[PDB]
C-alpha cells in the first residue's frame, strides 16, 4: 500500500458572514433570504461532528454551540472525513 496519508481530514469551500445577524456559516438561513439581510460569501474550512445516539453535524468552530436535535442533550464528538464530498446532481 501507499504510504501517508500526507493530508488532514478536512475540505475547503464557500461560506458566508451574514452582516444582520453577525454568523458565519455554510450559506444564508432560509429566513435570512426571505427577510433578505446583507451577507458577505469567502471561502473557509469546515469540521464534522457526531452525537452518541447517531445524530450529525458540522461547523467552522472547533465545536458546535447547539444541542441536539434527536436526543435534547449536548454530546458532540468530532468525526473525520465522508469519504465524499457530494453524489451525483439532486434536489432544487
Ligand atoms: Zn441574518
Ligand atoms: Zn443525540
Redesign the pocket.
Given at each position: 500500500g501507499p504510504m501517508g496519508m500526507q493530508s488532514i481530514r478536512e475540505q475547503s469551500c464557500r461560506v458566508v458572514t451574514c452582516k444582520t445577524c453577525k454568523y458565519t456559516h455554510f450559506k444564508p438561513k432560509e429566513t435570512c433570504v426571505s427577510e433578505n439581510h446583507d451577507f458577505h460569501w469567502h471561502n473557509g474550512v469546515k469540521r464534522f461532528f457526531k452525537?452518541?445516539?447517531?445524530?450529525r453535524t458540522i461547523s467552522l468552530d472547533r465545536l458546535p454551540k447547539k444541542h441536539?436535535?434527536?436526543?435534547?442533550?449536548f454530546?458532540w464528538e468530532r468525526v473525520g472525513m465522508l469519504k465524499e464530498k457530494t453524489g451525483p446532481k439532486l434536489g432544487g
Open positions: 452525537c452518541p445516539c447517531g445524530n441536539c436535535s434527536t436526543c435534547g442533550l454530546k
